Amino acid sequence: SGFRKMAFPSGKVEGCMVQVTCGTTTLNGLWLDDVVYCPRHVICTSEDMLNPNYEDLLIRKSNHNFLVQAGNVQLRVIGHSMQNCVLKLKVDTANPKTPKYKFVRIQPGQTFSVLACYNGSPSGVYQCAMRPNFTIKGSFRNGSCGSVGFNIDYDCVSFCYMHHMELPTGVHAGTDLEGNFYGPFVDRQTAQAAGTDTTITVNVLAWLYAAVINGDRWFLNRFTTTLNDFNLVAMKYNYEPLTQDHVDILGPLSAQTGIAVLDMCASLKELLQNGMNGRTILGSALLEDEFTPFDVVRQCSGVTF
Amino acid sequence: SGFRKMAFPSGKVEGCMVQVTCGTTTLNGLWLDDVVYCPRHVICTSEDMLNPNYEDLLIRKSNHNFLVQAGNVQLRVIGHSMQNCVLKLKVDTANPKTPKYKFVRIQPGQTFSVLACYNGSPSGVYQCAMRPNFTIKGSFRNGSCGSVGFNIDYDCVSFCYMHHMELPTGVHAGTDLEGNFYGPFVDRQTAQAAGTDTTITVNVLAWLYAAVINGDRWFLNRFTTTLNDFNLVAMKYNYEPLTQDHVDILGPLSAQTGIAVLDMCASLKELLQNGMNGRTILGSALLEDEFTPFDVVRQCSG
Ligand SMILES: *[C@@](O)(CO)[C@H](C[C@@H]1CCNC1=O)NC(=O)[C@H](CC(C)C)NC(=O)c1cc2c(OC)cccc2[nH]1
Ligand SMILES: *[C@@](O)(CO)[C@H](C[C@@H]1CCNC1=O)NC(=O)[C@H](CC(C)C)NC(=O)c1cc2c(OC)cccc2[nH]1
Ligand code: NA
Ligand code: NA
Ligand code: NA
Ligand code: NA
Ligand code: NA
Ligand code: NA
Ligand code: NA
Ligand code: NA
């Protein structure tokens, strides 16, 4: 038993982390087969990042201006191309540690493991949730750009995040592996503001199902609701509206407990209107929203990869 | 910036995880060189686990009785010994992915990364702290025995925990890699309670320093207390006493933020007597004690 914030085993990703350097600007890159993926601002100087023209800056760069290092071993760059905010560097060596992988763009509220890296060497791993305002409440310092976020499904690593910047509020923003930023952020050295964040309702409901599975079910009421009525009420409490996919991925937890999804929504609605009344759920007085229904199922079922 | 519960990269340990089966009992094993380390209760049956005479049960087992599998491959057991609660199975093949390693016994309050595994396959990784009552608050289910805890320094993996048991209260207990249990627990199928769980005081203070570094200051006050006066109140709330060693270890955090330790102690004292009301610290509604001063410095130095 027990419920902890669990990251995926990071071994398959550790073997793909390299260092990328242009002049004196250095960050992390992702080495899959014979291609290294990294943030495009590696080609910028400190002053270039203030107001960069990436098309102009890249046209002056040649393959021999890129230093890619797996540890201390250099991988010669034999080709380069820009795709949105990510630089793709073809190298002379196919990574023998390349796992089965996919490039995926995740939804807000979906979780993933972040392998924090500095100078191409992994330093730590932890689980993040993509906030509804497309930020992540991570832990990133200088030199962490290029660190990737990922999920593992069986033998396949689904890469979903690459780190680019830290907002003034201390949260973090980045792109998918195709270089498309999550949310309305740009890769420039400017103070950028994120939208008003909200609570991930599908994850709170999954956490409620996890409590019911563990015998903590005092919050179950005799009410039900429609999905539209609940979505309108939830927004008044700064909670995210539920999608059809949200109801679908809550299916297994609903079947395992016998509690209909819309019944759990009405129970959560009462918890928002009247509070907890000095009671706790799973030992916590706060409603946790960084556990997806997959995270609840994966943890309680001992799923391996 | 930012502060999060983070674990070491587990790749060096994933290459050592194997599956050990004896009879109808299956758990995880740690494959280092030509030795596989796993909990010794894998040799027990349902009736044995009640009151197992391990010396008597082990002598009655042969090499062929143990099925060790590393991924697809089956490792041939060519020898078997036992050190306390850890069974040692010698195999005819050395693990090529064996990293630089060492077996260490950590102290209460220190942290380590847990690679939770099932049937020899890694499932997840998270950070745990060795609580003062020598239990850990982890997430282990059936088949997780043999999962190990560790710390990594440079290229060396320092193994410090192997999982054995979940107490009725939901917390977990295990041994070091020499088979010695952390706490007064025994590897038998009985309901066992631990001593009173106190709070790691030096860790709460470091966590409060991390909150100040990250812009959380609402809990601070203008007051200062003495070391003894704080420990009097701390022990009243089942907090571990704060030693001058702990005060010195918090030094870099105190100098970086400009808040003296004794100043932070006065803030913690107010939090214990008045509570947190409805506010939170670093997103938590409770006083966290599973972050060491090193965990805070290593994450908030810049
Ligand atoms: C990368 O490591 C650089 O390669 C770096 C990671 C952040 C820095 C510290 N912690 C992090 O997460 N990313 C940056 O430095 C980026 C630079 C590119 C152009 C995106 N910039 C920021 O993260 C940034 C800039 C500013 C700013 O200006 C002025 C004002 C306020 C906040 C801010 N964040
Ligand atoms: C291992 O996976 C078994 O190899 C298992 C790990 C626990 C299972 C559930 N969650 C875990 O962390 N370990 C055990 O099952 C051990 C067995 C060995 C012999 C110690 N037993 C317990 O953890 C246990 C037994 C009892 C009990 O009896 C009766 C009564 C109440 C609680 C309890 N926990
Ligand atoms: Na609005
Ligand atoms: Na009960
Ligand atoms: Na209405
Ligand atoms: Na309201
Ligand atoms: Na939307
Ligand atoms: Na049911
Ligand atoms: Na022999
Ligand atoms: Na012999």
Short mmCIF file of N, CA, C and O in Angstrom, two decimals, chain A residues 135-184:
data_model
loop_
_atom_site.label_atom_id
_atom_site.label_comp_id
_atom_site.label_asym_id
_atom_site.label_seq_id
_atom_site.Cartn_x
_atom_site.Cartn_y
_atom_site.Cartn_z
N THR A 135 2.17 25.64 -17.78
CA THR A 135 3.43 25.66 -17.06
C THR A 135 3.60 24.36 -16.29
O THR A 135 2.67 23.55 -16.18
N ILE A 136 4.80 24.15 -15.77
CA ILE A 136 5.07 23.03 -14.88
C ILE A 136 5.77 23.56 -13.64
O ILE A 136 6.62 24.45 -13.72
N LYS A 137 5.38 23.03 -12.48
CA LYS A 137 5.99 23.40 -11.20
C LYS A 137 7.18 22.47 -10.94
O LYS A 137 7.14 21.56 -10.10
N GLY A 138 8.25 22.72 -11.69
CA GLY A 138 9.44 21.89 -11.64
C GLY A 138 10.56 22.51 -10.84
O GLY A 138 10.39 23.49 -10.10
N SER A 139 11.74 21.92 -10.98
CA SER A 139 12.96 22.39 -10.32
C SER A 139 14.06 22.44 -11.37
O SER A 139 14.67 21.41 -11.70
N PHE A 140 14.31 23.63 -11.91
CA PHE A 140 15.28 23.83 -12.97
C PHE A 140 16.19 25.00 -12.62
O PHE A 140 15.71 26.05 -12.19
N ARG A 141 17.49 24.82 -12.82
CA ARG A 141 18.47 25.87 -12.61
C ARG A 141 19.23 26.12 -13.92
O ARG A 141 18.86 25.63 -14.98
N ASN A 142 20.30 26.91 -13.82
CA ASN A 142 21.08 27.24 -15.01
C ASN A 142 21.74 25.99 -15.57
O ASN A 142 22.29 25.17 -14.84
N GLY A 143 21.68 25.85 -16.90
CA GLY A 143 22.22 24.69 -17.57
C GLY A 143 21.26 23.53 -17.70
O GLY A 143 21.66 22.47 -18.21
N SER A 144 20.01 23.69 -17.26
CA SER A 144 19.03 22.61 -17.31
C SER A 144 18.26 22.55 -18.62
O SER A 144 17.53 21.58 -18.84
N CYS A 145 18.39 23.56 -19.48
CA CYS A 145 17.69 23.55 -20.75
C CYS A 145 18.08 22.32 -21.57
O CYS A 145 19.22 21.85 -21.52
N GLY A 146 17.11 21.79 -22.30
CA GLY A 146 17.28 20.54 -23.02
C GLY A 146 16.89 19.31 -22.23
O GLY A 146 16.74 18.24 -22.83
N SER A 147 16.74 19.42 -20.91
CA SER A 147 16.19 18.32 -20.12
C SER A 147 14.81 17.95 -20.65
O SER A 147 14.02 18.82 -21.04
N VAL A 148 14.52 16.66 -20.68
CA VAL A 148 13.31 16.17 -21.32
C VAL A 148 12.36 15.60 -20.27
O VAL A 148 12.78 15.12 -19.21
N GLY A 149 11.07 15.66 -20.58
CA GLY A 149 10.04 14.99 -19.81
C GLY A 149 9.48 13.85 -20.64
O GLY A 149 9.42 13.93 -21.87
N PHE A 150 9.08 12.77 -19.96
CA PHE A 150 8.74 11.56 -20.69
C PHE A 150 7.80 10.69 -19.86
O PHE A 150 7.71 10.80 -18.64
N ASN A 151 7.08 9.82 -20.57
CA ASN A 151 6.35 8.70 -20.00
C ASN A 151 6.84 7.42 -20.66
O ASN A 151 7.27 7.44 -21.81
N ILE A 152 6.79 6.32 -19.92
CA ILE A 152 7.22 5.02 -20.43
C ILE A 152 6.01 4.11 -20.49
O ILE A 152 5.30 3.95 -19.49
N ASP A 153 5.76 3.50 -21.64
CA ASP A 153 4.67 2.56 -21.83
C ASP A 153 5.34 1.29 -22.33
O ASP A 153 5.87 1.32 -23.44
N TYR A 154 5.36 0.24 -21.50
CA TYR A 154 6.00 -1.04 -21.79
C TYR A 154 7.47 -0.83 -22.14
O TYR A 154 8.27 -0.48 -21.27
N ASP A 155 7.84 -1.03 -23.40
CA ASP A 155 9.22 -0.82 -23.83
C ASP A 155 9.41 0.49 -24.59
O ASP A 155 10.50 0.73 -25.12
N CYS A 156 8.39 1.34 -24.65
CA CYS A 156 8.42 2.55 -25.46
C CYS A 156 8.46 3.79 -24.58
O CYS A 156 7.64 3.94 -23.67
N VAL A 157 9.42 4.66 -24.85
CA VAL A 157 9.55 5.93 -24.14
C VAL A 157 8.86 7.01 -24.95
O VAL A 157 9.26 7.30 -26.08
N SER A 158 7.81 7.60 -24.39
CA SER A 158 7.06 8.67 -25.05
C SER A 158 7.61 10.00 -24.54
O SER A 158 7.31 10.43 -23.43
N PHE A 159 8.42 10.65 -25.37
CA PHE A 159 8.98 11.96 -25.03
C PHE A 159 7.93 13.04 -25.28
O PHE A 159 7.32 13.08 -26.35
N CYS A 160 7.72 13.91 -24.29
CA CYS A 160 6.65 14.89 -24.36
C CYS A 160 7.06 16.31 -23.98
O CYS A 160 6.27 17.23 -24.21
N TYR A 161 8.25 16.52 -23.43
CA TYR A 161 8.63 17.85 -22.95
C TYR A 161 10.12 18.06 -23.13
O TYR A 161 10.91 17.13 -22.97
N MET A 162 10.49 19.29 -23.49
CA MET A 162 11.87 19.75 -23.48
C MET A 162 11.92 21.12 -22.83
O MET A 162 11.15 22.01 -23.21
N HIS A 163 12.82 21.30 -21.87
CA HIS A 163 12.83 22.51 -21.06
C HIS A 163 13.49 23.67 -21.79
O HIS A 163 14.51 23.49 -22.47
N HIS A 164 12.92 24.86 -21.65
CA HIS A 164 13.42 26.04 -22.33
C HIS A 164 13.61 27.24 -21.41
O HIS A 164 14.60 27.96 -21.55
N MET A 165 12.69 27.48 -20.48
CA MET A 165 12.77 28.72 -19.72
C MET A 165 12.04 28.61 -18.39
O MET A 165 11.22 27.71 -18.17
N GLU A 166 12.36 29.54 -17.50
CA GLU A 166 11.72 29.70 -16.20
C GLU A 166 11.02 31.05 -16.17
O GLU A 166 11.61 32.07 -16.52
N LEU A 167 9.76 31.05 -15.74
CA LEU A 167 8.99 32.28 -15.66
C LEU A 167 9.37 33.06 -14.41
O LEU A 167 9.97 32.52 -13.48
N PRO A 168 9.04 34.36 -14.37
CA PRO A 168 9.33 35.14 -13.15
C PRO A 168 8.67 34.59 -11.90
O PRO A 168 9.23 34.74 -10.80
N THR A 169 7.52 33.94 -12.03
CA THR A 169 6.83 33.36 -10.88
C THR A 169 7.50 32.10 -10.35
O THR A 169 7.03 31.54 -9.36
N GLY A 170 8.57 31.63 -10.99
CA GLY A 170 9.25 30.44 -10.55
C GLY A 170 8.79 29.15 -11.20
O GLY A 170 9.36 28.09 -10.92
N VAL A 171 7.76 29.21 -12.05
CA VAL A 171 7.31 28.03 -12.79
C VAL A 171 8.11 27.94 -14.08
O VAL A 171 8.92 28.82 -14.38
N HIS A 172 7.89 26.88 -14.85
CA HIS A 172 8.73 26.58 -16.00
C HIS A 172 7.88 26.31 -17.23
O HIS A 172 6.73 25.89 -17.13
N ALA A 173 8.48 26.55 -18.39
CA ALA A 173 7.79 26.41 -19.67
C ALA A 173 8.74 25.78 -20.68
O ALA A 173 9.95 25.95 -20.60
N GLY A 174 8.16 25.06 -21.63
CA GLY A 174 8.95 24.38 -22.63
C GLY A 174 8.11 23.96 -23.81
O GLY A 174 6.98 24.41 -23.99
N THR A 175 8.68 23.07 -24.62
CA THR A 175 8.07 22.62 -25.86
C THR A 175 7.94 21.10 -25.86
O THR A 175 8.46 20.41 -24.99
N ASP A 176 7.22 20.59 -26.86
CA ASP A 176 7.25 19.17 -27.15
C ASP A 176 8.54 18.87 -27.92
O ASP A 176 9.38 19.75 -28.13
N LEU A 177 8.71 17.63 -28.37
CA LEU A 177 9.93 17.29 -29.08
C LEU A 177 9.91 17.73 -30.54
O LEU A 177 10.90 17.53 -31.25
N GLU A 178 8.80 18.32 -31.01
CA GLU A 178 8.73 18.94 -32.32
C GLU A 178 8.99 20.44 -32.25
O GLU A 178 8.84 21.13 -33.27
N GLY A 179 9.35 20.97 -31.08
CA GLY A 179 9.68 22.37 -30.93
C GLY A 179 8.52 23.30 -30.72
O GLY A 179 8.73 24.52 -30.66
N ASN A 180 7.30 22.79 -30.61
CA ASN A 180 6.12 23.62 -30.42
C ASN A 180 5.93 23.88 -28.93
O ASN A 180 5.78 22.94 -28.14
N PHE A 181 5.98 25.14 -28.52
CA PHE A 181 5.81 25.47 -27.13
C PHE A 181 4.45 25.09 -26.58
O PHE A 181 3.45 25.15 -27.26
N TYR A 182 4.45 24.64 -25.34
CA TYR A 182 3.21 24.47 -24.60
C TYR A 182 2.79 25.84 -24.06
O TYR A 182 3.54 26.48 -23.32
N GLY A 183 1.60 26.29 -24.46
CA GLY A 183 1.10 27.57 -24.03
C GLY A 183 1.66 28.73 -24.83
O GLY A 183 2.38 28.54 -25.82
N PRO A 184 1.34 29.96 -24.41
CA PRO A 184 1.73 31.16 -25.18
C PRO A 184 3.07 31.74 -24.74
O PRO A 184 3.17 32.90 -24.32
#
